[PDB]
Amino acid sequence: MGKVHRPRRGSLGFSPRKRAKSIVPRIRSWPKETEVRMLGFAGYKAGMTHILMIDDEPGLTNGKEIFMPVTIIETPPLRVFGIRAYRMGYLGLETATEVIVPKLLERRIATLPKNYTQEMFEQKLGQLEDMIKEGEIVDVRAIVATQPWVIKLKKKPEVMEYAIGGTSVEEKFNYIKEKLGKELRVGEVLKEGELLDVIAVTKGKGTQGPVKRWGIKLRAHKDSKGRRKVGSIGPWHPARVMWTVPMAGQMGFHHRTELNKRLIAIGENGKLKLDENTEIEITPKGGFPHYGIVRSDFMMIAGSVPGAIKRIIRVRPAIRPPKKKPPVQRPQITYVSVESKQ
Amino acid sequence: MRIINAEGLILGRLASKVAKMLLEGEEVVIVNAEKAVITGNRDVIFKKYKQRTELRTLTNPRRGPFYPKRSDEIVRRTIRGMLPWKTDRGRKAFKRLKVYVGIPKEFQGKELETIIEAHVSRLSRPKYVTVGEVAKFLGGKF
RNA sequence: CCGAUAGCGAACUAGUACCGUGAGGGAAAGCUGAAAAGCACCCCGGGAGGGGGGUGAAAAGAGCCUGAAACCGGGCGGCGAUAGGAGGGUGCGGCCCGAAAGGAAUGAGCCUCCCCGAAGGAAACCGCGGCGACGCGGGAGUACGAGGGGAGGGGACCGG
RNA sequence: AAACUCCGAACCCACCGCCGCCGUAGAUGGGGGGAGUAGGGUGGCGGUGUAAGCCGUCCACCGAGAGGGGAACAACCCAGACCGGGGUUAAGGCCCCAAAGUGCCGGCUAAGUGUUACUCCAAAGGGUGUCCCGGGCCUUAGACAGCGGGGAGGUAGGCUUAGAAGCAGCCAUCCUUUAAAGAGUGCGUAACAGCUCACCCGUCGAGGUCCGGGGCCCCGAAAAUGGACGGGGCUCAAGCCGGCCGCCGAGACCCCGGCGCACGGAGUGAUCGGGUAGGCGGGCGUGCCGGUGGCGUAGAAGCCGGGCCGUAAGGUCCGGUGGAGCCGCCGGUAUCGCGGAUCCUGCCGGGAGUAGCAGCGUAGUCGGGUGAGAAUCCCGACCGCCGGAG
RNA sequence: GAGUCGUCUCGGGCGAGAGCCCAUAUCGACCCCGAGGCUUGCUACCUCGCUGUCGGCUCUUCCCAUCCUGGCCCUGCAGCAGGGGCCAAGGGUGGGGGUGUUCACCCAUUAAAGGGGAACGUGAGCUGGGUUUAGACCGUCGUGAGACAGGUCGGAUGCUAUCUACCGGGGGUGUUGGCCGCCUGAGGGGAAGGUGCCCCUAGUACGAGAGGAACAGGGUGCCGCGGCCUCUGGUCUACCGGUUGUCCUCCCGGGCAUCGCCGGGCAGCUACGCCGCAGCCGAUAAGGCCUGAAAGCAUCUAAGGCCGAAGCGGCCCCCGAAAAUAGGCGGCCGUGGACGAGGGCUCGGGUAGAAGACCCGG
8 A cells, every 4th residue: 555544444432243141221321310200111113114394403494394214113001010229339339129019920031929928018118118217228220111912022021120210319219119000101201302312232133244244345356266355364473363353253133322313203002093293103004014013102213223123122311412403392293104114 | 367447558568568468378358448548740650550451452352461440459459469379379369358448347457557668658758649539530430 | 043014025825916008016914722522402683793591711712822002982099160381300288099029017107205416506584885777795505406326105007 | 103112011931949739559751542623602902894793812611511699591690519318608689479677877869760780771961950068259348139219420422424412333432520320231212302220328137149070860862562670569768879787598518327439458538429522441131052050731931010129221029811831040142122214114093073975057756666674776657957969 | 583773764962154134933054962773784693304575455453753633832923824843643644647566756636635663564365467487589798508687478376274363152160059030330442433614703803905814603515433224226036027949739827948038026135225423521731820939039830729632531332240359139949769949852933043042922
């Protein structure tokens, strides 16, 4: 070459690529640690559709038409089945105690008493003790579960943790407490027009090539033996192979966070109530390819979402606001679509 | 067993004396391995600790040198480098030492605190840092 | 003088088998038992194979006198899934067995006492010095010491 | 001033005497037989060449010689090594890893310098950075810096020039008078004017400013897998330099016995013990012969496993197997002893139960028959391939 | 390659000299001293029972004496724009035309189109153009055979991974007797961001004028990376239709020409499609200073103290109970030759998927 600087192909900012250790998304940012309500609301991705909206954010100047794809998701109502208490140790955060509170319970693979009533009352009393002191406790988080039963993709509860914020430890405890005996809403935690993060384990390709994972540029005039091979891997010394070099192995089934997708619309059904703005509750005829009946609470969120069709996705509020665009409270939907995916 | 409050204590003197004692058959527990003191120019003490952590064997296999970011581990690692770990006595020696962060004991055991090098003088030494400050800077939890 | 991976290539259907257009080149293959009594008859097995039972010796039952090592399977004894390698040597522990040829029961490993005693050589405390670290005098070549001798106790391993 | 000398050490060497030591278990010297006949290396003194390298010379040593220490490190240090035991030091070290000092006194240090004899460890220059010594200036004859007052008169010094009037520039740089004055340090003006310094007295009421050697520490100082003081870590030291003291620590050195060698006859050795090339000498084992003397079915050799002895080569015994031959002793003899030859041959394992049984114009599949067993044997049906040429 | 450092590259010290005057705005001789291993050469140490050459291609690591971006200082800095100096490897540093060419020359773009080491990186990865063999011609020289750092044409790139490395996937123990689900965050990794334009500022500051900046706010592009197909584009030997030859007598309905060919295209997979990818703070460099001495004053330093980088950490994104400090919580369980909680194999499908696993229904 001639010492030609070449930018890296693949990344180390996302590498390694491998299988997720749980099908529950991972979290290392908490946007509702000191603030009420859960970290968004979880559903199953129905599919996608598209919608035409009016600026909103200026494409050129405000008042012009913009195209936007939107991912329509059947969410179940969620319901608190467990209270988690923490005590802060000296090696990190450690689990004080828990209350566990109960055919879906049967489909779940999780362990079951066998003296339900008894165990539950002891954990509950234990918790009141912890709550009183009150500074033992430094934060409280909620074990929360999905409830699929009108949804055909899977019917087992996927069980996850979301924190429940509050100003102080006693307040988080009261809020969480009211919640166990109840259902929950897309409406209660979240509202239209915030920018929100999306967390999901992306679609599994299975094992894929250097061509696919890292990208491999093509070569010279004619190549007898292939153009999809690895080339050099390295010198004579280093005497060992690195990990920064093109290989084949897993792509997908990896957890990904994509930031800041604007919340367009909330409703319920779909296609059993017809509105002229905020989306017409867009449900394709012939149904969605490879996905079960829709009829429950839903949300249609902007742009892309990590996760292909038929996969449990989770939503988290944002860890940053937009930074040269203004937020818009309540997006505007100029005209609608009713297209088929067929 | 010895529970040493290593507040004030130069890490090296504590480790040398500790590394011989554990080998004799004794148990040492260090409490307060974050409030302990290291003399020296601030700049060089940070450059040494960062460099170690940064490694990156050549880009890092997921093997080779790791150095920890937290001070509690740094003392514990320092006494282990003073012991072996592929000799019987040494490999055992590392399990006779444990670090507890801060003091969550109600005991203080045997204390060395003599002014000979092993404990600082705060009015005769031109410059020092507390170790906890540097651990924060490296990116540790503490 | 040599003795069947030796002496003729060849001790046994050998200059044979075999190769090469040809000229020409060229091996390997010795041993039941006294006598074949070389296994009747029976169960099983598709079975002519093999197994069970009867076969002086069969571990002489068919290239069968004898029957090595490398090697394969199972088992016994030891080790073993958080720790390091020219695979061990020397010392000292564990576990494991050891009928014989060894040494010892006419006393083995072992233990105890008494004494001799090479090279070497303290302690307590005291006195006097030394800025002090510590030295010096007395304790004292003493206590102590490898090794050896004798006597005694015990009674089966110890060596390996 | 290699190849000059009015001159010239230390030092080398010849010879005599002495002294020392060595020698009649034979030195000093001669003759004979048998060999081997690639060198290296630290230092000193060199010659060449930038150098590394090459080549002379002498050399401890490695070569052929261990052991303990130098982190490890052919030749740097200590030390020359029969067997076993006990003891004490040497080189070197004494913060931990690791035996033994969180040693002592004092000075140097603030760079993480250094903690490295080393094979490992970068310079000229320069710093009111330090500490320590030197003689000068100078101290109420007290400006060392501040500060209160200072910066005269002749005069514009002259020339040049409108102006050069301290201040475009050139050269001179003189005299009177004193808180005080330089034909003027800088600013300023077109040039003046104006602002101001050195300077001085006096207050502050002191010891003041200097210069010059040395030791050290800083600056000078940029490199490619994580590499550095052996590692960790160490800043009143676990650093540096100058003293000092107590210990740790070798096959050395010491010591007891045993053993060989040398010497002593038909015990003794401070003055003995490493070992390749090579020389010399002794024994064992192997096959067969001869002589001599024994053993065997009441159980040979061989095989296997175990015991025991001898520094050893090697031998012997026991138990099992085996089912006919077998030793010892002495004197002879050689197709006489194997770890290697990219050795020859036989047997056997890993690789592996992997690759191969796919690639070219790519064929079977369903019933039924037979049989110990049927995807691929046969019969029937259906479908192909070849078709002037599988 | 090692050794070596004359040669080469680069630095430092001294400052002759010109720059109207003024050595240092800038340029800088004579001479003297280091550093590096990047050119050349020396060495004969290592290999002749082989350690295969150069260049390109592809793929990656590291270094700074740093081309650009950030932060800074001077000026013979009016502005615009240069010149010179300091920090700094986080990121970027391109495409073409000739040469086999490393190197070098050229064009227009660019914020800039930086260099060097890694077996003169990279042939058990490709290529085999160049060094280059056995064939041949020409020039030169030779009696001749025959030669050439002269020119030139054409002239093989082997190997099924045993060991070990790295990327992905399973099976088990330890797991302080086992177990099911949920978490903690030791540490490891990163560039998840980089960069440029335009308008407003402003025809302003500044300038005699010509000419012409900056802070800050909006819109857009580019590159890298990651994800996603509803739109639009690709494909689609699912399927459907049109059609040549030929065969079945044959309309119908089919075979074959190795999808016959052609035309359309759903799901799905993809870009030539779409969407996403912060700030701030703390501590610091270079720098600017405060108080303030050594040296009663002055002085950014000798101590104390205030700010201040694209660099450093947090924040952010990726992985992570085999972290032996082997973790926490909650629940479930035991108690040949008694009894038997969890769990798999089974079945119907995948959100999954090389085997296995994973997941869900039964």
